[PDB]
Symmetry: C3
Subunit: 544 residues, 3 copies
């Protein structure tokens, strides 16, 4: 109801100099006015799509918070079609910010995405919705698969960190923003039935650039520093990569990307908008089940001769070598039996060695046959399918290496396979869950800068940046940005110490996984420090 | 040899600022205390709670929390509280001294300011116990157990803790909370005795705050932003804020007006508040009347109902739409029937018909001989959030040439009264964007305009919020340590007002949601100087 | 381009530049992620020691403990508790030659990290670790080996380099005391815990961010050290003595399960919502609750009252009606309802706490293929308290009934749960059992409350959804200021904090009444940190 006597007695019962924590002198700031400015741009096909935006106005003193709008068209026709999650980020191949004196800042599309991955709002705007990312089906040539939509891509820049204090100042200079787009093939998930040829011919990127402009009265410009991300991709299947000309790096990131060039980029399933590891696994199990347990009158027809479809015993247990599969379906008609496809997908490099068989990954399958729809309605499924199984390209099941067929699904099931060309996949699975780096070594010149076995550098990245999707990262700067010059690793060119060399030991994937034959590329990102000066327009100088 | 050199700082090689040590300043001597007050209740019979803060030792205060003791709800019928029940109770909050109002806010604006604070919304409260629609079976059955909810009354005094705190220049502070009618916070069916509940219900509030007893306080003048709201006329796409001299921001949004309805909806998902939960609760409510397993043509439906026996094929054609219906274990003496016009809307006898039965493409299930019900399995439909937000009144409106609610009397009896006061847009999730274009005028000159909702995208990015509004921010300067940046008036040139004009998106006249009345809401934050000369006072910056 | 109205509104007074800053040159330093193996020592309590000393490691912060979990092989049910890595920790101590610099009890470290979802995930929390897995053969793999990471949050992390621990050419020892592995594992009777316990060893590794600083200019600082007092079992009071400069005081309750075998009917695994706990429990009871049998069901104790369901579908258990309807029941069989599955009472013709009475509707379909009932819709009033009742309390001496009338199959599936960080009297700490709280500074009442308004403030101020009744005395920003504290008056006897609570009561006929409670009181004392002749701390008085 009021302050207690014990508290009152503990204070009254003034000799020392105290900092006022109950009042502040409200400083008058620089006089300015912000404005959201939107620009249309010019489209070019060098046949890569490139959008240019020129910002040249005597009243736009500073700017930040770049947002790119993209108009997605109405998608009509036959077939399965869906956009990749965060489709807007996946459109971007490269972003460049330039003045008359050259590039001020630039970034690779995947690195922009990596920098925004911990911003759920920016990712949502990108966008990510059941409307965009579920795999929709067109049943007629004039059927609407996808309605037209607008996505917003937040182009995070070093100018956003401290709002007005970090904004790009325009020294009565012309700024150009150049966005290079990925082919539309990257952002779209589709089956064979979908007329991609026509879609590709007719699709056009329709972008618009927004930014927060500031009209500042008597701006007092000071020099600053900015970090420019630089990326190097290693050779296919080489466990090494080098970044040359490293003189002042604030950080270094290391990750892996799969390379699907030895494939047709076709996968059995995709979960759509639902993106959890369990959603990927459930979408895959769901696609296999129709061919795995068959309720038929006599041995099931329409499967390759290589298929081993066995009638389930009265026991319910089918033995596929060491693995027992318990199959029990209720309401099976008297003229019909329950069959198990014991080798739905199988892989082996040697005829009497190890076999990777997807049918062996199921231990229990129960359900009820429906006389009304003539389908089996699966109830409980016990299995050991993982995220890697859902990430195996179909090409690797039917590869030359494989001594077996070894894709014994029905023709109906194979026609439902999807082309996935997402350009920002990491690791060897869709969720980048499996850590395939067993050991990492970083060399600065000839000296070992850092080495680790487990991903403790990923744990630090995730803790320090409050991200649940980090990468193995070394950070050399722990100083607050903008108010301090960033701390860096510094070169010694005479001792040949001006290169960062990364070496990894990859995990053997275990014994005979078809995912061992997924080609990998090592990615190394280095953040170089640059000085930003505004003497005769905006200019940047690499720190050396 | 598989060993690797383990050497430290191998990447290492004037006045420098020390980043490894700091001089720990001695702060003002103070002592905080959590103080709780009961108030005085007063009653167009609107409930008002007053709390008077007067103590020579409370030097400053912040972090206001209002407690509310919700009563035990007994009786027959369906009852549930709206999500974030405690915020929806608040009509208005006012903080006053002897010199007048220091700060005040409309209930919806307090809620909009706390929408990103998941903790404060949970305390509000939001739970299965409060928000699921509970059913009372006997007149002495307990529908809802008594409960306490906490409403964090976010004020400008919390931004920088002690630095931004409200200083009581040995003045009396009065906090006045105006409550919304209990009708607004309760979701109920016709069976529930609302008349008695309303007569007997009383708001039981308590105000807490963090008080600070400060030794030799050195008070300095400061600035405060006071939110000011203007609501446009029904269906008017314009609104004006007059006497704008120093504004830090301007927000624009839409609210539906349900005065042309009885505020009854077919369904409500309860505690589960996702778009999918709203859609699933609605589909679930329609399914008992949509697919019927009956011995002969189903009874108990209006004559306007067109209930058709499903062919051996399983496909029923409703004009251009094919509905595949297949139910297992149907008894031999019975057939499967499909309600082909459960809900239908047309403005002309030969116009386009909006039919909810046409929104279903596949319905799978098993009839239960034990419970004499159909247990639905897989449903393929195209029901959206707008369908679940249609008031029942609009389906049976004078503008409809059809009946056009052909549901059973049992289904219509399960309809719920929803009077949530903080609904935005034309659907429960505020998913549909109905503003096609926005123009903001400062005087007669165009300050800002947009076609797409880029100002909402910026609001959401800058405030890290997933529920933003079209907002124009003029202040990008850090709060408390600087005088806020404002849009400033030119009275001589007539630039002393903010006029908002929107262009609403169009839609077909044959969709019941076309008849939802809309109100434009404009929120302006005006800058005020906080003085302490003879107790606390605020002065509008002009 | 900028509109004319904006240009016209702009185009003697000192203005602060908000569009440019002079980029200060910081102290020259170089960070490094350093990892150390320690020394393992053995109540045969496991203790890991890590010694940090290097002429170039000047400062450090952001301690992360790695734990290598082994491959778990054999027969039976096994799972790790959620946040396994935090639950491993009994105590963490940071020491110099001059003594302890900072230390914390494992539960208080966990409490400090509970609002950090990333740190908790790294702990870890996954279906792989936390679902209850089953081993079918003696060489079957129940759990694959895994690594967990425990972020050991310290006061040195608040302001990165500014708050970092400086090493004045001193040797810093980090000592981690581990809980017995019995605390972090959820297992059934079938699992060979004896062998697992004998063979299990903690395999830890300590990482930290080390800083090599050129010409470090050290300044004295302040640190808050958490101090915990646990009250006598069921005693609603606790005292913290020698309180001279405290920044906060926290109060909470813990259950004590020493009067039990720590066995529970169910556990939801990785799925940790209140509903997941309730659904896992209902699921475990269902196969004994509704039985499809040819004649009266066999294999239940003589005390079991299994009744054939009438044609009506309604079975009356006193005042409670249970509607049971199962489809596809074979002609030679009937539907039976177990009317006293679990029952508890302290007198014979009095009140009965009966779990079977908590069900109002049960629907399902019998499966001829698997000879099971596949349950569909269930209407019950089971709560989080029911799922938190140890099995021991159903069959206790106070109970005049049997009163666990489940099948032997169901009882064999019971799980040992020894999670060391449970609060309240239920697994979710949902039930508030403190009716009133009083805090005394000396003999004077410092604070008192009925409702948990101090928990509401804790949750608001720390942006946490799992707060405790807390009194904060410090609202001053950390590192840049000396913390504000409650200060002692030794002459007036105000140099101690006494807590008294009034517990709510659940009835004497509820098995949960017999769950023992412990009052926990946490006090944060202010200490001065000085670096004159190694690192040392001094209690503020």
């Amino acid at each position: 109801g009021a302050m207690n006597n014990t508290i009152i007695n503990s204070l009254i019962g003034d000799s020392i100099k105290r900092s006022n924590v109950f009042a502040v002198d409200s400083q008058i700031p620089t006089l300015y006015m912000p404005q959201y400015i939107s620009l249309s741009g010019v489209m070019t096909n060098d046949n890569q799509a490139i959008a240019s935006f020129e910002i040249r106005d005597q009243y736009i003193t500073a700017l930040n918070h770049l947002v790119l709008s993209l108009e997605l068209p109405e998608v009509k026709g036959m077939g399965r079609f869906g956009y990749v999650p965060y489709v807007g980020y996946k459109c971007i191949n490269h972003v460049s910010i330039s003045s008359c004196n050259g590039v001020i800042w630039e970034i690779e599309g995947e690195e922009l995405y990596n920098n925004c991955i911990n911003n759920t709002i920016a990712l949502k705007h990108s966008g990510y919705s059941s409307e965009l990312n579920d795999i929709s089906i067109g049943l007629t040539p004039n059927d609407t698969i996808k309605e037209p939509s607008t996505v917003y891509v937040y182009i995070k820049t070093p100018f956003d960190v401290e709002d007005t204090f970090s904004s790009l100042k325009l020294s009565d200079s012309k700024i150009t923003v150049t966005v290079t787009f990925n082919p539309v093939s990257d952002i779209v998930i589709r089956d064979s039935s979908f007329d991609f040829e026509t879609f590709n011919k007719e699709f056009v990127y329709v972008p618009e650039l927004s930014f927060i402009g500031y009209m500042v009265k008597n701006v007092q410009i000071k020099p600053s520093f900015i970090e420019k991300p630089r990326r190097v991709i290693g050779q296919i299947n080489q466990p090494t990569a080098t970044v040359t000309e490293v003189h002042a790096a604030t950080s270094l990131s290391v990750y892996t990307k799969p390379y699907y060039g030895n494939t047709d980029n076709k996968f059995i399933s995709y979960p759509g908008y639902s993106q959890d590891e369990k959603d990927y696994i459930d979408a895959y199990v769901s696609r296999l089940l129709d061919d795995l347990v068959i309720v038929s009158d006599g041995p099931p027809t329409g499967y390759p001769e290589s298929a081993e479809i066995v009638e389930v015993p009265e026991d319910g247990i089918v033995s596929i070598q060491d693995a027992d599969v318990y199959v029990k379906i209720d309401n099976v008609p008297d003229n019909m039996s329950v069959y198990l496809h014991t080798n739905l997908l199988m892989f082996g490099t040697r005829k009497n060695s190890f076999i990777y068989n997807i049918s062996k990954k199921f231990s229990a399958i129960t359900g009820t046959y429906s006389d009304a729809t003539k389908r089996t309605i699966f109830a409980h499924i016990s299995h050991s399918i993982n995220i890697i199984d859902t990430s195996i390209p179909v090409s690797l099941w039917t590869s030359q290496r494989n001594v077996y067929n070894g894709d014994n699904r029905s023709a109906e099931s194979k026609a439902k396979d999807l082309f996935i060309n997402d350009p920002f996949i990491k690791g060897i699975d869709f969720k980048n869950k499996t850590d395939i780096i067993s050991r990492l070594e970083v060399r600065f010149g000839n000296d070992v800068l850092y080495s680790e076995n487990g991903p403790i550098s990923r744990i630090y990245n995730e803790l320090l940046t409050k991200s649940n999707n980090g990468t193995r990262t070394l950070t050399f700067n722990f100083t607050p940005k903008i108010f301090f010059r960033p701390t860096t690793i510094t070169a010694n060119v005479s001792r040949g110490k001006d290169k960062l060399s990364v070496r990894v030991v990859y995990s053997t994937m275990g014994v005979n996984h078809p995912i061992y034959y997924v080609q990998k590329q090592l990615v190394v990102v280095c953040n170089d420090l640059y000085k930003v000066s505004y003497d005769q327009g905006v200019s940047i100088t690499k720190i050396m």
